[PDB]
Amino acid sequence: GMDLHSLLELGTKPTAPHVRNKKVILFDTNHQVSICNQIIDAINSGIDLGDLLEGGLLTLCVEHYYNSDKDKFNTSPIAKYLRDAGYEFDVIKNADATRFLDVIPHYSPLILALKTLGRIGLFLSFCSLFLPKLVVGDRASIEKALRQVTVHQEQGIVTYPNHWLTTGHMKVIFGILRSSFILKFVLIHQGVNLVTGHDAYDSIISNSVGQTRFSGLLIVKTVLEFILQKTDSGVTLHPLVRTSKVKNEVASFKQALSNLARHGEYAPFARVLNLSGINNLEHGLYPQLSAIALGVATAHGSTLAGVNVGEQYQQLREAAHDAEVKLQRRHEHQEIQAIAEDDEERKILEQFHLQKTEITHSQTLAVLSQKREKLARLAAE
Amino acid sequence: GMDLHSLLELGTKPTAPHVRNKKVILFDTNHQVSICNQIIDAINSGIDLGDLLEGGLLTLCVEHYYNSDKDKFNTSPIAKYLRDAGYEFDVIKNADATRFLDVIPHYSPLILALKTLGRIGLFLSFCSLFLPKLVVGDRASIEKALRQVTVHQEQGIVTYPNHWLTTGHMKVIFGILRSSFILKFVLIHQGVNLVTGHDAYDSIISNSVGQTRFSGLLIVKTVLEFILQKTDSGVTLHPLVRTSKVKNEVASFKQALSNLARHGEYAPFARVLNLSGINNLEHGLYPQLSAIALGVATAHGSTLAGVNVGEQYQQLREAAHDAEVKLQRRHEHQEIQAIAEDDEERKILEQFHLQKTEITHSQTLAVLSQKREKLARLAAE
RNA sequence: AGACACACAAAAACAAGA
């Protein structure tokens, strides 16, 4: 009895092959800070380096995190992991280069644009500010960038240049970050693998990386924290999802999650970096499961009601919301009657539970009205 | 049955890697006290050393704690722990340097600023005064700095220069301390690892470090001292938090706490020094748990009612406050009826308990009114 | 022959006392 359903899955197990071969060029320049400042000046003017973009951003990376040290960079875990991923790093000794145009190897638009010609930490932290809401688009991305700038200035950590706060500048930074994989990956690796010794700039990087965890993968968090639960008897299934309708869907989700598992420590950033198997965690491929999980999560988490969802999911999400609210009131009643001893703690615990549920209800309605207002202003635009 | 929920956690276990490579330069100068006084004069004038900042503050550190001894400094536990963290220490022999500008290796603003040109213990103790309230911002930071200066003058320990008490000077010191990791870490290490032999200055350092314990980590103290308790049967769960709503949240908090455990003796200063896993102890990631723990703590500790919290937490915190007050009156009634022997001690113990609860109620209301008044003046600003 | 659908969507520093 050969397994037929494996033909539904064999397309998602590449057995770890090697395809990538990118010629990323490294620069050894005595005027390291000078060329880095030139790169920053080029970027703030909205200049697209294209092919040179990877090299320039890697130069900024090595300057800020290794102080122009190449021996340690090429043996760093970033370098080894990109060895696995298929990135080639080679060093070019342009020691006497002073102008930015000297180091660059279809160049005509770039050359014509360049005719117009710890700040590195400022630039890298500003780029990292885009990570938490990078995949949601550009509107919310720049909104959260502005919020992060305001909160960081309020904490007194960093005071950014005023000109960087212009809408065009964040648009350029969003474009350059979305189009470049190396900037993302180095930022996430530095945020994740740093243990101690953070300055202000590395602290901002680490905070942005932590906020970027599971960005664009809300389905993963919702399903794992609101449907599949580990008890003392192993993993259990949510009572609301025992139907085959979503049972097969959960089986498919488990398959996709196991496929995503092989990526490793960077699995939470799979949507940010577009890793393999990320398209198998799509909302479209799990419509009912996504709607049910999001409804249950909204029932638990008040702030989760602010998520905007497609119009084909709203009714199911609201139904799951109401159902899960009822089952949770049921479960709190069961726990109160089961675990306690006498009537006094029954009454005080149930009064507290009623107050907490009322507070969550009010907060959920407020955030739902806020989401309605946001959709209204977006439609009016 | 592979563990799926490990994909929710693999991003927070770096397996102790090495990323940092900072070129911290050490200075061997015969005019050690002279260059240190020059550094102090530069700082009091609000001069930002930037790159030279780490070297200058390390020079002050080695002067005050080792009397310009480099052999013991480079083998000190600070040096070894920074070996692990990825700091490189190299010595430069600028023996004949007299002007501050001689020892410094984008320098133009710094050079132009420098054209305008046991006090070391005074400077270091003044900096350490900022540690207890460093992460709360600048307002409360300078307020507690002023309070500490007043109390230390009253004890007769130290009499600071009057010009250092100007608002601009504490602002500069707050900026220099917040932007520099090395100053923090050396201050905390000296405060923690000192056993005896404190002079006045090291005594101030140790007192500030002790007051800095768990700064910005009030959630940790509240959860560990008001929710999870060790009985003779191991750790127990608070009756108010047996709901799954916060049960999963406590599981996540336990995960984050275990992640923070690997840091070691500097775990209480994780928020101060921005260690790894500090962003996993966020209030946002544990809204209900943070509000409940803070409410319970306020019910126990009267002075804890003065904490300012976000507007989305106030109702839940007050509900937890009232509930915990009721459960504690319940528990005192149980203990009095259970552990005692006859009626006389029942009556006197219950009268004392009633008086104590009334006193705590009055103090909590007073501090709540004080917090209201503080918020009122802050809003009026 | 084939026939559909399928980016993302929220929140997220700290807060007292000593």
Numbering used by the authors:
A (entry chain B), B (entry chain A): 1 to 105, 109 to 120, 128 to 391
Article sentences:
Marburg virus (MARV) is an enveloped, non-segmented, single-stranded negative-sense RNA (ssRNA -) virus that belongs to the Filoviridae family, order Mononegavirales, and causes lethal disease in humans and non-human primates. Therefore, research aimed at investigating the MARV proteome to validate antiviral targets and to decipher the structural aspects of its mechanism of infection stands as the utmost priority. Among the seven proteins encoded by the MARV genome, the nucleoprotein (NP) exerts its fundamental role in encapsidating ssRNA into a helical ribonucleoprotein (RNP) complex, which in turn serves as scaffold for nucleocapsid formation, viral RNA transcription, and replication. We determined by cryogenic electron microscopy (cryo-EM) the MARV helical ribonucleoprotein (RNP) complex structure in single-layered conformation, which differs from the previously reported structure of a double-layered helix.
To fill this knowledge gap, in this work we report the detailed structure of MARV RNP complex in a more compact single-layer conformation, reconstituted in vitro by assembling recombinant NP onto synthetic ssRNA, imaged by cryo-EM and determined by single particle analysis (SPA) helical reconstruction. In agreement with the results from 2D classification and 3D reconstruction, atomic modeling of the MARV RNP complex structure describes a single-stranded, left-handed (h -) hollow helix with inner and outer diameters of 164 Å and 285 Å, respectively. Each helix turn is completed by ~ 25 NP subunits, and repeats with a pitch of about 70 Å. Indeed, our structure revealed that an intra-chain, non-canonical parallel coiled-coil is formed in the MARV NPcore between the helices α15 and α16, stabilizing the C-lobe in an orientation that favors both clamping of the ssRNA by helix η6 and NPcore interaction with adjacent protomers via helix α16. Interactions between NPcore protomers and ssRNA are only intra-strand ones, established in such a way that any given hexameric RNAn is wrapped by the corresponding NPn protomer, but also interacts with the adjacent ones NPn+1 and NPn −1. Overall, binding of each NPcore protomer to a 6 nt-long tract of the 18 nt ssRNA in the asymmetric minimal unit of the single-layered MARV RNP complex follows the same modality, and involves the same set of highly conserved amino acid residues, as in the double-layered structure, with any hexameric RNAn tract being clamped by the NPn η6 and α17 C-lobe helices to accommodate, twisted in a “three-bases-in, three-bases-out” conformation, into the groove beneath the NPn N-lobe. Moreover, substantiating the rationale for a sequence-independent RNA-binding fashion, most interactions are electrostatics in character and established between the ssRNA phosphate backbone and basic amino acids such as Lys142, Lys153, Arg156 and Lys230, which were previously proven by mutagenesis as important - to various extent – for both RNP complex assembly and ssRNA synthesis.
